[PDB]
Each structure stands twice: as C-alpha cells, then as structure tokens.
Amino acid sequence: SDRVRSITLGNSTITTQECANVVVGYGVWPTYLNDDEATAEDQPTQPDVATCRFYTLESVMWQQSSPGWWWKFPDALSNMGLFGQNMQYHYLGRAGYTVHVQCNASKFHQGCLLVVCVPEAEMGCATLANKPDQKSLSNGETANMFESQNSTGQTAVQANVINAGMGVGVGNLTIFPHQWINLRTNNSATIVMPYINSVPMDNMFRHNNFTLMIIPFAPLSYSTGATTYVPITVTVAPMCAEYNGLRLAGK
C-alpha cells in the first residue's frame, strides 16, 4: 500500500512497512548546481555513489521524561565515510539530504514525536552576554538533548524545549518541513531536504545550515510489563553532493 516504501541510495537501502509519506522539502527535489547559478570556476567533484548514500547516526533512548534531541548537519556527517573525507579536502560543498527517523513500538505504546528540519537554526546561549561554545551547538554524530527546564552555563545553549533553543514557539515549528511519528500510526518519518542557502555553495565546516529536531509532544507511555527501551535511530543520506576548492585537508 502507501504505508510501505523503500529508498535505495548507493549501496544502501531502507525498507519501511509502516510509514506515512515522504515530505519533500518545499516541493523541490535536490539537484546539481547549474552553470547559470554557479560562480566557482573549477570543475567540481561529484563522487555520486561513495558519498550519496545512507549513514546511520548514534541512537538515543526514548524515555518518559525525554524533552527531545537535535543534530546539526553536515556536522553530524563530518566523520561519516567518504562524505566526511570530501568535506575536509574541499573549501566549498553542496548537498541535499534524505532524512529517515525510525522508532518502533509495541502497539500498546503511545507517544508522538515531532520530526522537523529547521534551516539556519541559530541557537541562543544560556548566559545572555556570552555565546554558546562549539560543542554545545553540535556534538557531531551524537545528539544534543533539549531540557525541560531553564539551562545554566557560561557557554551552554539555552536548551529549554519550549522555545526550541531559538526563542520561538515550539508549536510553531511546523512552518518548516516536518513530520510526526505517532506510535499508533507509523514507526518512521522521512524528509527530503534540498540545499537551502543564500549562496550556491558554502563551507561545510563553519556552516550547517539546517538542524534536525526530534521533540516528543505526547510523552512515551506504556503499562508495566511492556518493553521500556524504545530507541530512535536516525539515517541521513546526502543527495547530489558536489565539491569545489580542493586543497590540503582540514578541518
């Protein structure tokens, strides 16, 4: 039916028997930069198979008091195979992403997760005068956790989930490309993100520029005697990745 779906990228495949649909960005499928949009003159690199493939991040464990998590991209993929390698040797880069969040339950479990990709998600620090340090913003392959109370710390991020680290209403995050994992309905959510930026290409190490947030709006719940370990796995795949500006490796 329309609940089944498969996605093959590179030498990787993801099957889902209980999905909702695919959310495709803003109706735009990711493509390669055209000649009339390009400004960098050297012939770009396009690995096209070794990089445009699925990578699985580190899983988290959904608990009854989990406020939520977030990843930064492509910082989360900065050490993933040849995709991270091309990022180090190149000054400029460009990709779109297929994002697949997967969480299965027992049909007696309940809870609803919001899965959203926020472009240019600039986050505030817990101390108003300071700035968040590098690790609080993006731990790479590891998720940074939202809090269900005000954060403290000179370099900490204001991770109170009610504002989503950005100073907005967390219920208003549905303006971005989003989906819901509702345990009674579906065990996965997938979003295809095109490349969004104010320039045709950017440095992949000092800019993201979208964040993945997973926020439980309905908490996890079950009766005693059921499985209590409900993990959420994240599998991202860059699409149409190209690179410009080859030189020595860094960072």
Residues 109-148 that bind other proteins (CB under 8 A): 118-125, 128, 131-132, 134, 137
* CB of 31 or CB of 228, closer to other proteins: 31
Q: How far is the CB of 227 from other proteins (least distance, A)?
A: 22
Closest by CA position to 205, among listed 92, 112, 37 = 92
**Residues at the contact surface with a copy of itself, assessed by CB under 8 A:** 10-11, 42-50, 53, 81-82, 85-86, 89-90, 243, 246, 249
With contact defined as beta carbons under 8 Å apart, do 79 and 58 qualify? no
With contact defined as beta carbons under 8 Å apart, do 214 and 113 qualify? yes
Q: Which stretch binds other proteins (CB under 8 A): 61-69, 173-181, 215-223, 227-235?
A: 173-181
The letter for the amino acid at 242 is E
Residues 45-104 that bind other proteins (CB under 8 A): 49, 52, 72, 98
Q: How far is the CB of 203 from a copy of itself (least distance, A)?
A: 16
Q: How far is the CB of 34 from other proteins (least distance, A)?
A: 9
Of 102, 104, 158, 235, the residue at the interface with other proteins (CB under 8 A) is: 158
Fill in the per-residue mask, 219 to 238: x = in contact with other proteins (CB under 8 A), - = not in contact.
Answer: --------------------
With contact defined as beta carbons under 8 Å apart, do 214 and 115 qualify? yes
Q: How far is the CB of 191 from a copy of itself (least distance, A)?
A: 25
Which one of other proteins, a copy of itself, none interacts with residue 167, CB within 5 to 8 A by kind? Answer: other proteins
* CB of 130 or CB of 228, closer to other proteins: 130
Distance CA 95, CA 221 (A): 38
Distance CA 187, CA 189 (A): 7
Q: Total residues at the site for other proteins (CB under 8 A)? A: 91
Q: How far is the CB of 66 from other proteins (least distance, A)?
A: 18
* CB of 225 or CB of 247, closer to other proteins: 247
Looking at residue 32, the DSSP 8-state letter turns out to be: P
Closest by CA position to 189, among listed 50, 27, 5, 1 = 5
User: Is the four-CA dihedral 158, 187, 49, 33 of positive or negative sign?
Assistant: negative
Please provide the DSSP assignment of 43-78 as one string. Answer: PPB---SSSSS-EE---EEE-TT---EEEEETGGGT
Instruction: Please tell me whether residue 172 binds other proteins under the rule CB under 8 A.
Output: yes
With contact defined as beta carbons under 8 Å apart, do 168 and 99 qualify? no
User: Is the four-CA dihedral 168, 171, 172, 175 of positive or negative sign?
Assistant: positive
Instruction: Please tell me whether residue 247 binds other proteins under the rule CB under 8 A.
Output: no
The letter for the amino acid at 236 is V
Q: How far is the CB of 48 from a copy of itself (least distance, A)?
A: 7
